[PDB]
Amino acid sequence: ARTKQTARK
Amino acid sequence: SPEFGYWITCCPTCDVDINTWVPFYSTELNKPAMIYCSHGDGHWVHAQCMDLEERTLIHLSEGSNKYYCNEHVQIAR
Ligand SMILES: [Zn+2]
Ligand SMILES: [Zn+2]
Secondary structure: EEEEOOOOO | OOOOOOOOOOOOOOOOOOOOOOOOOOOOOOOOOOOEEOOOOOOEEEHHHHHHOOHHHHHHOOOOOOOOOOOOOOOOO
16 A cells, blocks of 8 residues: 555664 | 645544654654545545554555545545
8 A cells, every 4th residue: 555654764 | 745644634633733742652742643534535644642542553554555634534435
């Protein structure tokens, strides 16, 4: 699913 | 558009507010995590407002599975 702000920092 | 789209009222019980929001998920810093609901023409919702645990959200983000928000998840497809 498309998401936002789910990338690890 | 950097923040446009993030500060919407995603559902009737949406708790995300530009005037009160704070990070919840480990992947958040200054903006709420969001996930696309594939119902109808589709729409964006805040993951926290869906009571999605972090691993569930991350797994969804790492795959091709479509997501349906709590309001539309029970609708005949
Ligand atoms: Zn919301
Ligand atoms: Zn939906």
